[PDB]
């Protein structure tokens, strides 16, 4: 099964072949979800094993099978559970292109029911589906995903609240102007406020991050400033260790994507001090991660360097130290 930090690709190959053989059973045996759930858990190599196994899932035709039998009741949750853990970038594209409606609807009905594992699965699927495009975000809003996450914002489960915060951040980033207007109409800040004041640092971080991304839009700045949650940014960045907060979150995974960070870049140039503080904090985190993985040139491909320098120059010392440390971790 799963052991430790070694140089073994034989396990990648073994469990990929197991997965493809089980998937070939087309005309229950959803231990594929257990194997992938524990594959992502591998201490350091979990990213590689997970990506290779999800690619094996798509290539063996299993992704199409999941999207097909997710409108069948007896195989609904059993399949959606596995789909929440294999919504990689390529799989995300495949789903968005050849069956968004079914996946969105199964996530909605997973959140509608009282069983907590189902709600976790549904909120996670929605989170991952909000990381594609303005068009995809608009469509998911139309199909009722935003309503589901804003309803789950009232929950107690921690996994669900984390999925909800990450989903609202992803939507603030990938939505655009129209979708951010829609978010303000749905009173997104109202239900983000209960999350920003959470004790769990992940929920607070990503809720505040969605709020910061939202104040950057100069049309909704006031309504997002009525929340109150940006006044919780300065104590957080000044009391949290950028390297250690990375190790707890988004370090097992190789940080956020270059496109996620590209959406975040324009936050570095906002009117609000707290927005720039939090964006700088996040970039100082991602810079160290990317340096560990040798993908630092990303920050130049997204024209983040100009904004990082402009921020490292500005008077505000909270963001100046973070942006400067980020620039040194790149070159």
Ligand X SMILES: O=C(O)c1ccc[n+]([C@@H]2O[C@H](COP(=O)([O-])O)[C@@H](O)[C@H]2O)c1
Q: What is the spatial distance between Cα 103 and Cα 89, in angstroms, rounded to a whole number?
A: 16
Q: How far is the CB of 118 from ligand X (least distance, A)?
A: 16
- Whose structure tokens read 């006044």? 231
Beta carbon nearer to ligand X, 16 or 85: 85
Burial class (CB in 10 A: 0-12, 13-18, 19+), 55: middle
- Which window, 43-51, 143-151, 186-194, 319-327, contacts ligand X (CB under 6 A)? 43-51
Contact between 253 and ligand X by CB under 6 A: the answer reads yes
Q: How far is the CB of 45 from ligand X (least distance, A)?
A: 10
Sign of CA pseudo-dihedral 250, 130, 135, 215: negative
Q: What is the spatial distance between Cα 280 and Cα 256, in angstroms, rounded to a whole number?
A: 14
Q: How far is the CB of 46 from ligand X (least distance, A)?
A: 6
Sign of CA pseudo-dihedral 20, 25, 28, 29: negative
Q: Are 283 and 267 in contact (CB under 8 A)?
A: no
Q: How far is the CB of 55 from ligand X (least distance, A)?
A: 11
Cβ contacts of 244 within 8 Å, gap of 6 or more: none
- Which window, 40-48, 98-106, 193-201, 298-306, contacts ligand X (CB under 6 A)? 40-48
Which of residues 50, 122, 255, 288 is near ligand X by CB under 6 A?
50
Beta carbon nearer to ligand X, 46 or 99: 46
Which of residues 22, 30, 47, 157 is near ligand X by CB under 6 A?
47
Beta carbon nearer to ligand X, 197 or 260: 260
What b/e sequence results for 2-30 when a residue is b if at least 16 CB atoms lie within 10 Å of its CB, and e otherwise? eeeeeeeeebbeebbeebbebbeeeeeee
Q: Which two tokens stand for residue 60?
A: 């063996």
Q: How far is the CB of 57 from ligand X (least distance, A)?
A: 11
Q: What is the spatial distance between Cα 129 and Cα 93, in angstroms, rounded to a whole number?
A: 9
Q: How far is the CB of 87 from ligand X (least distance, A)?
A: 4
Contact between 40 and ligand X by CB under 6 A: the answer reads yes
Contact between 46 and ligand X by CB under 6 A: the answer reads yes
Beta carbon nearer to ligand X, 126 or 214: 126
Beta carbon nearer to ligand X, 47 or 94: 47
Q: How far is the CB of 227 from ligand X (least distance, A)?
A: 26
Beta carbon nearer to ligand X, 87 or 126: 87
Residues binding ligand X: number (CB under 6 A)? 12
Concatenate the DSSP letters of all residues of 41-69 into one string.
Answer: TSTTTHHHHHHHHHHHHHHTTHHHHHHHT
Q: Are 165 and 126 in contact (CB under 8 A)?
A: no
- The length of the chain is 331
Q: How far is the CB of 237 from ligand X (least distance, A)?
A: 23
The site map against ligand X for 64-103 (x = CB under 6 A) is --------------------xxxxx---------------
Which CA distances in Å does 105 have to 175, 282, 291? 20, 33, 39
Contact between 252 and ligand X by CB under 6 A: the answer reads yes
- Which window, 45-53, 209-217, 285-293, 307-315, contacts ligand X (CB under 6 A)? 45-53
Footprint of ligand X (CB under 6 A): 40, 46-47, 50, 84-88, 128, 252-253
């Amino acid at each position: 099964a799963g052991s430790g930090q070694q140089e073994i690709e034989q396990t990648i190959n073994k469990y990929s072949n197991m997965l493809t053989s089980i998937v070939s059973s087309l005309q229950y045996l959803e231990k594929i979800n257990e194997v992938i759930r524990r594959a992502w858990a591998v201490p350091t190599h979990g990213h590689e094993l997970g990506y290779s196994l999800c690619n094996s899932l798509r290539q063996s035709g299993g992704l199409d099978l999941l999207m097909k039998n997710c409108v069948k009741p007896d195989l609904q949750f059993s399949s959606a559970q596995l789909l929440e853990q294999c919504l990689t970038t390529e799989n995300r594209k495949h789903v968005v292109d050849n069956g968004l409606d079914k996946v969105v609807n199964v996530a909605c009905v997973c959140t509608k029911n009282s069983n907590m594992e189902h709600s976790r699965v549904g909120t996670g699927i929605l989170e991952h589906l909000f990381k594609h495009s303005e068009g995809t975000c608009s469509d998911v809003i139309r199909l009722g995903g935003l309503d589901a996450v804003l309803f789950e914002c009232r929950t107690s489960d921690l996994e669900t609240l984390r999925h909800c915060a990450s989903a609202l951040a992803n939507l603030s980033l990938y939505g655009g102007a129209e979708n951010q207007e829609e978010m303000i109409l749905r009173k997104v800040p109202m239900w983000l406020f209960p999350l920003a004041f959470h004790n769990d640092d992940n929920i607070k971080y990503y809720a505040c991050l969605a709020i910061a991304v939202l104040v950057a839009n100069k049309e909704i700045e006031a309504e997002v400033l009525k929340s109150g949650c940006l006044d919780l940014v300065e104590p957080f960045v000044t009391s949290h260790d950028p390297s250690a907060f990375a190790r707890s979150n988004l370090a097992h995974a190789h940080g956020q994507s270059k496109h996620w960070l590209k959406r975040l870049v324009p936050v570095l140039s906002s009117n609000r001090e707290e927005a720039r503080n939090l964006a700088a904090f996040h970039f100082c985190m991602e810079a160290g991660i990317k340096r560990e993985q040798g993908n630092t040139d990303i920050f130049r491909e997204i024209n983040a360097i100009e904004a990082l320098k402009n921020v490292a120059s500005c008077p505000n010392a909270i963001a100046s130290k973070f942006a400067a440390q980020a620039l040194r971790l790149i070159g």
